[PDB]
Amino acid sequence: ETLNGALVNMLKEEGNKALSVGNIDDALQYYAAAITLDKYPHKIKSGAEAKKLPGVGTKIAEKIDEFLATG
Structure with a gap:
């Protein structure tokens, strides 16, 4: 429902990816x-x-930019 929910879902995907590589710290950061x-x-x-916003990093911002570039 939230205007950013779509991006939030994409962030969850990124978090899972970080977990897949053993980067639990980064995954938690994405969730935050x-x-x-x-x-x-x-x-x-x-x-x-x-x-x-607290918890957002440069890499996360880049993912947001990419998602906007896709639509």
Whole structure:
């Protein structure tokens, strides 16, 4: 329902990928960013803005940019 829910799902996929490589710390980081993005009350137009939120990293912002590039 949340405007960013689609991106949140993609973040969950990224978290699983990090787990697949044994990078549990990164996976947890993605999950934290996903929760914050959900709590945020507005659709985000770019990942760069997303970085402002606690738990969002540069890599996560880039994923957001890519998703926007896809549609």
